[PDB]
Design a protein around this ligand. Structure first.
Ligand SMILES: NC(=O)c1ccc[n+]([C@@H]2O[C@H](COP(=O)([O-])OP(=O)(O)OC[C@H]3O[C@@H](n4cnc5c(N)ncnc54)[C@H](OP(=O)(O)O)[C@@H]3O)[C@@H](O)[C@H]2O)c1
Ligand SMILES: NC(=O)c1ccc[n+]([C@@H]2O[C@H](COP(=O)([O-])OP(=O)(O)OC[C@H]3O[C@@H](n4cnc5c(N)ncnc54)[C@H](OP(=O)(O)O)[C@@H]3O)[C@@H](O)[C@H]2O)c1
Ligand SMILES: NC(=O)c1ccc[n+]([C@@H]2O[C@H](COP(=O)([O-])OP(=O)(O)OC[C@H]3O[C@@H](n4cnc5c(N)ncnc54)[C@H](OP(=O)(O)O)[C@@H]3O)[C@@H](O)[C@H]2O)c1
Ligand SMILES: NC(=O)c1ccc[n+]([C@@H]2O[C@H](COP(=O)([O-])OP(=O)(O)OC[C@H]3O[C@@H](n4cnc5c(N)ncnc54)[C@H](OP(=O)(O)O)[C@@H]3O)[C@@H](O)[C@H]2O)c1
Ligand SMILES: [Mg+2]
Ligand SMILES: [Mg+2]
Ligand SMILES: [Mg+2]
Ligand SMILES: [Mg+2]
Ligand SMILES: [Mg+2]
Ligand SMILES: [Mg+2]
Lengths: 251, 251, 251, 251
């Protein structure tokens, strides 16, 4: 227990699914947490379901909103003190091949999945460097930052960008002794509310030709690797990709 | 010889350096070539230096210009017939860490390096599929689509995006029997005019801790792998990354 | 705490350095542990330094010894009950290029680093499958399972073999619902007794051109990722590579 | 044409299938070739089918035979002059999971696929370095040097070892200015005599969940990438992996 003692974390898209599980385990391990999402109804209920305002609060923010990122860090500092930990988890998907992606779809997805992660990573470095916080930026990528999917063209682009941009940030932070690590987490298929709302999705994701374990994961599978990466347990890990995918990318 | 017999190729950024070498070898192997760039002075001289208008022409185009991509394919079809081959080579770099990248720099680089490659790949699939051309899309990435560089944050993002987006397109084209392959080429450091204009750059790039061969490459090093990928010699290669880097990524 | 409640672990080469740290943290998290090594003087002192015989014991064994692997699993079962967890950590290095490796050096290194990991993985699957133990095989690889080093030819061969052989085992175990996961851990440079016995080694390993963090790691850096992989926290992770290297492979 | 002018090549396992196609294209591009295999009936017919003894000869040799490697290089030098090019292509497969691999199977496969490639690579460096030959060692790996297959445990081990050992050799040769490059080729499924002798194999290999192109390749697909790597066209490529797999590893 207390694996995140003293840590102050921002988790984008932390009001449902994977992000909510990360927030729940972060609080359980002693972190103070600010979760974000676009809808305040979901967000305020999510925060209250996890802990008191002394442990966890909600901040309404679209991760594509550059100016809002400043307000998000400001509000987290005011509530909890200097931010030590950022999980860039908010993301969207378009079910389109590259061939069939409209430019509006392309720009919308990249605004959230790529611009948003860049805005959070850039600001995180500027706010967390040189403070002795054992700071950690955890950028959510995907198995689809490693392998293509024919119907996830823009998603693939964004997750490949997050994968390699994070290595750049890791190196710069390491070479400059900033006390900031940057790593990526790559979930396979995980049982989320979106998955349960798509008839047949889970069965398709569980075929052995997709997930060799024959079933999909659960949100706490991603929460636990994020606890390790936020914790000083992982103080020598930077610039690395952490895959939790039921074997998807091993075949 | 005649390794590209009958092929019709568009090469973006084909008026100098690597792109010009690709265009030169493509013409030598029997392809008809349309090269692009932003400046007509450079472009018309480059075309004339390689061959006659029956072999190679110039089309003025910024690869970030979505509507211009349609006009580029139209003009190439009018000159040479249906396009079989696209080399998405135009790209720019910003010498900034993620931390120090302005949003204007971020958007400018991504417009050329990511949006431009998406526009060309998407249009290429739509124009080249199902025509029996043995079509090939060659997306220029970089060693910096594999590894970070602390001073190339936005570049890293764009080249990681190109790397994985290209796998998505490769899979969709393969699964749908489009007769279009998509692969990425990843140059290491190559002696180009930009390199020769930066005092000390080549020596820095040639340190054994960067390039184990102790020297950088030349534009024809990238031309030759592009000839292989454009040719029916590589008819079973799709979704793959081809690295020509003097050992940079092997250590 | 109790992150390894009920687990029974074998750690090869667990009497010094990284393996001893893994064993120490495993016991702290509630596992029962059998550590191995070739020298009983080191091994019995190591076990006693960590806990009582009810928590941790030593078994003298060279990991290249195929028949001894059976006796090792037998003795662990007798002391602690069915084995749930195997860390294949024992390994040796030869400071030779491929060109300068003698065949005797080649065979000696592969006997420990490759045959030994195969013997333990094969036996582990046979002993741990279908017992509801949440079983986990953690194969120690290296950054040198990803990148070459000109003076580690045989080592590179063995660590690349361990990396991909482990994916085969992961897939078979997943597809057959064996309740056995297989993953690899890839340390960068870690401060060990061998390192401290080589004058100048740590400084060389800490150059930014090798480790961007500017220093090497410590044994607990590898212990903590092994706790995560042995624990049911990582029940959806199989067939994956976990790198803890101070940024070495990110550039 | 003449892409291998003046080159002198050894191709192991060059008497059937992929190795024979490599030998055929090498001769077509002007190389002198010594092919090997265990059976002289196959080997002498293969050589005669490709060219005259002035172009191509056969040498009977099991690639696991260390002393025979010396005799093989000696005989090639005597026939054709100093060897510039080595394709380590001979290899075998066992259809067994790690769990079900006998130690005899393990040692037999590794003797050919790993020891043999080490013996040829080590000797090749010693014989080809510092002679101004533009020397190239092409080590045949596999898609199964990248991803696991549950029924190819020992094969996976050997191909992962070849993949990373080759990077070590590439780096040492580059750093020491030996004028020797080392790269790996990774075929997907290819229509060979062994494949045609297994009922149902090709259909299984052609399922979209295995090969997205929906069919397997042919031996000339691997010959053409080997011509590029043997040729001075690839003089800046070393330490790299070249995949020709119909999309297998892209998903
Ligand atoms: N037939 C259909 O139309 C259909 C059916 C089922 C599912 N879907 C999928 O549903 C998706 C939309 O669902 P969703 O995005 O609300 O998923 P979600 O599962 O709610 O997203 C997970 C988390 O990310 C947050 N989040 C999402 N976008 C964010 C942003 N820009 N900035 C910050 N946090 C963000 C969410 O909170 P907030 O949402 O409150 O921001 C939530 O906390 C569509 O893109 C579509 O693929 C479509
Ligand atoms: N101190 C300095 O300011 C300094 C000094 C030296 C170098 N530099 C670098 O020089 C860079 C600009 O040089 P450059 O881009 O002209 O390089 P370049 O070497 O000319 O670019 C190579 C090729 O790509 C083409 N190209 C470039 N951008 C393109 C686009 N958007 N669409 C299509 N083709 C394109 C070029 O033609 P066109 O250029 O005609 O389009 C040319 O054919 C700066 O980004 C900077 O990093 C700066
Ligand atoms: N100039 C020199 O000669 C010099 C100087 C300094 C270091 N070295 C290096 O020292 C190395 C030998 O040291 P070491 O192997 O004893 O290292 P070590 O640091 O003791 O090895 C770490 C752990 O692995 C165990 N282990 C080693 N080989 C094993 C095996 N085959 N089976 C099971 N467990 C095994 C060790 O216990 P056990 O050792 O008790 O088995 C120990 O628990 C040489 O290979 C050399 O590279 C050489
Ligand atoms: N039911 C069955 O038993 C069955 C049925 C069909 C196929 N098979 C498979 O057939 C395999 C044996 O076929 P094969 O190895 O002869 O295949 P192959 O297709 O003949 O091998 C390709 C090339 O490699 C050469 N080669 C093979 N081993 C070599 C070595 N150790 N050193 C040098 N060159 C070597 C071969 O010549 P040489 O062979 O003349 O050396 C040939 O030139 C078995 O391992 C099995 O998987 C088995
Ligand atoms: Mg929502
Ligand atoms: Mg795959
Ligand atoms: Mg210019
Ligand atoms: Mg010792
Ligand atoms: Mg590197
Ligand atoms: Mg045979």
């Amino acid at each position: 227990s207390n694996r995140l003692d003293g840590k102050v974390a921002i988790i984008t898209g932390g009001t449902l699914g994977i992000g909510l599980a990360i927030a729940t385990k972060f609080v359980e391990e002693g972190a103070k947490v600010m979760i974000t999402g676009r809808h305040s109804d979901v967000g305020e209920k999510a925060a209250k379901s996890v802990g008191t305002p002394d442990q966890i609060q909600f901040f309404q923010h679209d991760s594509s909103d550059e100016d809002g990122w400043t307000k998000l860090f400001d509000a987290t500092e005011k509530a909890f003190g200097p931010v030590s930990t950022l999980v860039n988890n908010a993301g969207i998907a378009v079910n389109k091949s590259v061939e069939e992606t409209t430019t509006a779809e392309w720009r919308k997805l990249l605004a959230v999945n790529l611009d948003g992660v860049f805005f959070g990573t850039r600001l995180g470095i500027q706010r967390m460097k040189n403070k002795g916080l054992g700071a950690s930026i955890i950028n959510m990528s995907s198995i689809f930052g490693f392998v293509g999917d024919p119907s996830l063209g823009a998603y693939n682009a964004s997750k490949g960008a997050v994968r390699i941009m994070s290595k750049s940030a890791a190196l710069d932070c390491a070479l400059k002794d900033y006390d900031v690590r940057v790593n990526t987490v790559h979930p396979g298929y995980i049982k989320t509310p979106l998955v349960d709302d798509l008839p047949g999705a889970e069965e398709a994701m569980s075929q052995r030709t997709k997930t060799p374990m024959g079933h999909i994961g659960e949100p706490n599978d991603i929460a636990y690797i994020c606890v390790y990466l936020a914790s000083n347990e992982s103080k020598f890990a930077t610039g690395s990709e952490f895959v939790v995918d039921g074997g998807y990318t091993a075949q």
